[model samples]
Target chain A: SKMLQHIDYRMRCILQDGRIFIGTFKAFDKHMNLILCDCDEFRKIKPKNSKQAEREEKRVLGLVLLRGENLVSMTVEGPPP
Target chain B: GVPIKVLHEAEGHIVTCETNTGEVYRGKLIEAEDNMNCQMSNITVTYRDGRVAQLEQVYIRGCKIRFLILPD
Candidate 1:
């Protein structure tokens, strides 16, 4: 499939929740469902109880399955070294 | 036949389905059809607020889905 052409490349996906995931594309289907390895999630943390300032955080997910429906967009990054 | 073909390729694979409402379901795809109705097993549903629900088996309606992620 045409989408398979992106396999093994680094990519970034933005989700409907406004979170971002950067990872190596491993696989995907027509539904746009994607499997990524070495995936890292970037999330914006909101202030709790209005006492602290908001900040961004990163979480590493060695392997992750991202539902295509939740995706806003995805961009293929430069090839891995 | 396209729907059947797609379903056939995803058979027995773990999949994640996200609905338009931001609920996410993860499970093994047991059956699927063109209209988007799908049967899954060992399902886990996570809500936008971080709440989660699980079920042994469930059927999902296609129209409510935003997208699906299937095993490679």
Candidate 2:
């Protein structure tokens, strides 16, 4: 069983375009792919490259979670491809 | 360097204060706040019966005496 709950909060996060991401962190992956549930269905976005750098910046801002090896593998439930 | 000397260690995550009496205090940096000066929060680690224990914040400083950059 996993801890499931509804997230209703707004936060500021930096994107590739230097725009602030103010939404809920619905989900994430090792590649830093953020499934941001924007307030008004703006558009889907994700980091292009350098996962570590993006993760570090997000960590310093105290916003979003840095998906570590422990959590990454847990999120991926697959026996093969 | 003497009393009131500041040294940034831990690849920019820690700031050290060296006193004239050869005493040292290390704290994890929170942020620079403004300008290039960093604000560090003093963390006190308490060992409760040997299980690695808990850490607590002691205080914060407005200005930092040293600066360091995280390596790539």
Candidate 3:
């Protein structure tokens, strides 16, 4: 269950309005509210607006752990590489 | 417009894939990862109503190739 334990850890970070980041994590300091992660990929920027109607600009990542209701589940739809 | 050729590897291989929305997926290449560009197939994804059907066949381009080897 060590792997699962690693996956369920909590994280704290500031989402700058619309910017996004994704990665597997190590741990976080609740005291400072800093996120310490072993990112597979780190720091990505996404576009805000584009002039395409039916076609929308979006980004996604796989196998991300998010702090949820008493659990951390995998999430998508974040920064792109 | 000239036809651009796409290629991919078989399922369960490791690859770096991208979507039309510019999302990057780096993990086990369970489906498409061999062509110049391939589409994802029949991905059983977790949805609001439970796991459901979604886009099959994803476009893949080989770039930033890195291999991870963990110490035993």
Candidate 4:
């Protein structure tokens, strides 16, 4: 399982409405539903090429679940944790 | 724990959930499953355009839900 192998690592996910979530890739199921630990939410962000890319808002959240169907894409943040 | 397990655990509780389309629903999570589908009652829906409505019940599609906010 390529994805399952990354459990306990950090990952970032962007949803359909432009809201972004980054957290520990805790667990998932066949539906791709995800549970992230110590999650942080990005309400809005600037382009990829800005030093103040995180200027908008970053809300800290605890363990949370994300519906997989809403996710547009994902990327590895930190691994081998 | 699996996210589905958490969803099931939130049953019959006052939960706030948001949809991918910028709508927010605060209500009791009556039932859950079927790809994270939710059954809510006595829920309030706020649309993105600044309009709100009180719905007695709603069956939100599984994929429509962005995330859930459990009672704090």
DockQ, each predicted model: 0.17, 0.01, 0.02, 0.51
- Candidate 1 off by > 4 Å: A1-6, A26-35, A48-50, A57-70, A76-78, B1-10, B14-24, B34-37, B44-54, B62-72
DockQ of 3: 0.02
Worst 10 residues of 1 chain A by lDDT: A60-69
lDDT of 1 by residue, B1-72 (tens): 233354557869887776768798999999887666789999999999989999999888876775566554
Docking outcome class, model 2: incorrect
lDDT (C-alpha) at residue B47 in model 1? 91
Q: How do these models rank on TM-score, best leading?
A: 4, 1, 3, 2
List TM-score per model, in order: 0.58, 0.21, 0.23, 0.74
The segments of candidate 2 whose C-alpha lies over 4 angstroms from its true place after superposition are A1-9, A40-81, B1-72
What is the TM-score (0 to 1) of candidate 3?
Answer: 0.23
The runs of at least 3 residues in candidate 3 whose Cα sits more than 4 Å from the true structure, single-residue gaps closed, are A1-39, A44-81, B1-16, B24-35, B44-53, B59-72
- lDDT by residue (tens digit), candidate 2, A8-81: 33434443333344444444433333333331112244557756333322212222221111122222221111
The model with the greatest DockQ is 4
RMSD of each: 4.8, 18.3, 15.4, 4.1
| Model 4 Cα RMSD, 1 decimal | 4.1
Fnat of each prediction? Answer: 0.14, 0.00, 0.00, 0.64
Q: What tens digits encode model 3's per-residue C-alpha lDDT throughout B1-72?
A: 000111122344443443323344444444333222334444433333443444555444333211111111
What are the lDDT scores of the predictions, listed in order? 0.75, 0.31, 0.31, 0.80
What's the i-RMS of each model?
6.5, 16.8, 17.0, 2.4
